C-alpha cells in the first residue's frame, strides 16, 4: 500500500527526468564542441576567432551553471532513501554520489577555479572524457529511472 | 521547491531566476504551507501549476491536522498496553510475577505451552524478585 518509501520513489522518478534532461543537454553541448574542434580551428579572421571563443565561453558557462543542480538533486535522492530506510537503492546510489563529490572538489585542471575552463576545454582528452562520462551517466540515469518506477509499483501493489 | 526552481530557471517567464532560486523557492513553499502570504508569486503556467497543487496540499493537511486534534481533545481514549498474555511475554518494560511458593508458580514451572515457558524463563531470570510472599503484597 501507499507508504513513505513509495512517495520517495515517485518523487525521485519525477526528479530523474530533470537529470536526464541535464545529461542530454551536456551531450548536445559537447557534440557542438566537437563540431567546433574537429572542424578546422583556423582563426585567421579576427571576427571568426572572436565568435568561436565566445561560443566556447558561453557553452562552458552554461555547463558550469548546470552542474550543481544535478549533483545536489542526486544527493537529495540519497538522503531521501536514507531516511526512508531503503538500503539497497542507497547502496546503488552512494558510488555516484562519491564520484560527483570527487569530481566537483578535485579540479584536476591545474587552474582549479572552474570545473570546466574555456582554456582547458577544447582539449581532445578532456573533451572525450566528458563525452564518455555524460553518456555513461545518461545510461545510469535511465536505468535508475526504470528501477525507481518498478520499485514504486512493487511497493504500491503490495 | 526543487521543481519550482528548475521550472523557473530553465523555462523562465523572460530576471525570472534571480526570483525563484532555490532559497526563495523554499521560502515561497514554506510561506504557502503556513497559510501566510508571499513576496513573490509565479507568473509562468508551470510554476503556477506547482503552486496550485502545493496550495491544495497545504489546505488539506492543515484542515486534517486541526480536525483530528479536535477529535483527540473531544474524546478521551485510554488504551491498555496489554490485551492478552503473549503481549505480556513480548513486552520487557512491564514486569510480572506470581506469589512465591504457590500453585500458580507450580503451573508456570511445569508448563508445556510456549508462551508460559517464556514467562517462566523470564520469572526465573528476573532481578529483582518479581515473586511475592502474599496476595496483598
Amino acid at each position: 500500500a501507499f507508504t513513505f518509501a513509495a512517495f520517495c520513489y515517485m518523487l525521485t522518478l519525477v526528479l530523474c527526468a530533470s537529470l536526464i534532461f541535464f545529461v542530454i543537454w551536456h551531450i548536445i553541448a559537447f557534440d557542438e564542441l566537437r563540431t567546433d574542434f574537429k572542424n578546422p580551428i583556423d582563426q585567421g579572421n579576427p571576427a571568426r576567432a572572436r565568435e568561436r571563443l565566445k561560443n566556447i565561453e558561453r557553452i562552458c558557462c552554461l555547463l558550469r551553471k548546470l552542474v550543481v543542480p544535478e549533483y545536489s538533486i542526486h544527493g537529495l535522492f540519497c538522503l531521501m532513501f536514507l531516511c526512508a530506510a531503503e538500503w539497497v537503492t542507497l547502496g546503488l546510489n552512494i558510488p555516484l554520489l562519491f564520484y560527483h563529490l570527487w569530481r566537483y572538489f578535485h579540479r584536476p585542471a591545474d587552474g582549479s577555479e572552474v570545473m570546466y575552463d574555456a582554456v582547458s576545454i577544447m582539449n581532445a582528452d578532456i573533451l572525450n572524457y566528458c563525452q564518455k562520462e555524460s553518456w555513461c551517466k545518461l545510461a545510469f540515469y535511465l536505468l535508475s529511472f526504470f528501477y525507481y518506477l518498478y520499485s514504486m509499483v512493487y511497493t504500491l501493489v503490495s | 521547491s526543487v521543481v519550482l526552481f528548475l521550472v523557473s530557471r530553465f523555462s523562465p517567464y523572460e530576471e525570472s531566476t534571480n526570483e525563484f532560486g532555490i532559497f526563495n523557492s523554499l521560502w515561497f513553499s514554506l510561506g504557502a504551507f503556513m497559510r501566510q502570504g508571499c513576496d513573490i508569486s509565479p507568473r509562468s503556467l508551470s510554476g503556477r501549476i506547482v503552486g496550485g497543487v502545493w496550495w491544495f496540499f497545504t489546505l488539506i493537511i492543515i484542515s486534517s491536522y486541526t480536525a483530528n486534534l479536535a477529535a483527540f481533545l473531544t474524546v478521551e481514549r485510554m488504551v491498555s498496553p496489554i490485551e492478552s498474555a503473549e503481549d505480556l511475554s513480548k513486552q520487557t518494560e512491564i514486569a510480572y510475577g506470581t506469589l512465591d511458593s504457590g500453585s500458580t508458580k507450580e503451573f508456570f514451572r511445569r508448563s508445556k505451552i510456549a508462551v508460559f515457558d517464556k514467562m517462566w524463563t523470564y520469572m526465573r531470570s528476573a532481578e529483582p524478585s518479581v515473586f511475592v510472599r502474599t496476595t496483598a503484597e
Binding site: - | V3, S44, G47, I49, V53, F57
Partner: peptide, 27 residues
Amino acid sequence: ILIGGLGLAMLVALIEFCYKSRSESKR
C-alpha cells in the same frame, strides 16, 4: 495529485522551453 502536478509542470516547462527557443531562433 501533487506528484501528478509536478510532472505536468515539468512537461509544460519543457514545452514552453521548446516553443520559446523556436520563437527566439526565429528572431
